Amino acid sequence: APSGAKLLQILNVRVVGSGERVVVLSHGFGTDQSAWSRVLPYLTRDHRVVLYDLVCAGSVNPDHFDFRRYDNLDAYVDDLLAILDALRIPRCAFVGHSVSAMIGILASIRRPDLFAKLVLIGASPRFLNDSDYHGGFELEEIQQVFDAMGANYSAWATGYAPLAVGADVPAAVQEFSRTLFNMRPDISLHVCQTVFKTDLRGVLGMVRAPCVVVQTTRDVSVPASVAAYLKAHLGGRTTVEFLQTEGHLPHLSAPSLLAQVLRRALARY
């Protein structure tokens, strides 16, 4: 199990920007840290920005993927904390998309003094529907996703990428498709299974950090009522920022709009 030190190289850690305020950018499913490329220059004039790849990214050597360890999001949390501890960063804001929003929630419970603020993009505590809980998916829907991913990964990714982007932004579709195709198909399926089975509803109240939940007008994996649920149950002061754009990947499809929200959220913490 690589130390935080060795993880700095394995997970392609980069530190850029200037200033005292540290911000971690943690990418979502199907991308790598290049997904932050379009929004990054809106932060680096006056924030010190830490970027890294999740172990499941195609830009990480697939020989490092451990199918036992990473069948729970707690192992991804371990990696994040090991990087921050290796970098000797005692306090930061954290921006997470998708699975990284879940990682950030869990990390803020594991190490409450380390996270001054959480910004969650495309975030859900639970995708499966439950009693009086609308997450957006039934068990048979997620099973069909797994079956499609395993039977024909290329065809599944080609159909999924425009749905995830949502808006008619062809470069965003191409960029998301490229990193989706860069993932090894068995690792992609494994991460998808891990995310779809996670249920964080019972620990949201243990988050102490103030939070900004960024929600678009239509997100194929996150109903608007799930953003409200996060605001209702997160333990810190929480604001939902509604972005006037469609899709699950606003950092790819609407970076200037997302940047305005991020700069307001990261101005003071």
Ligand SMILES: CC(C)C[C@@H]1NC(=O)[C@@H]2CCCN2C1=O
């Ligand atoms: C059915 C569609 C509206 C949802 C979409 N489909 C998918 O296959 C991917 C799998 C990961 C998240 N996904 C999604 O949210």
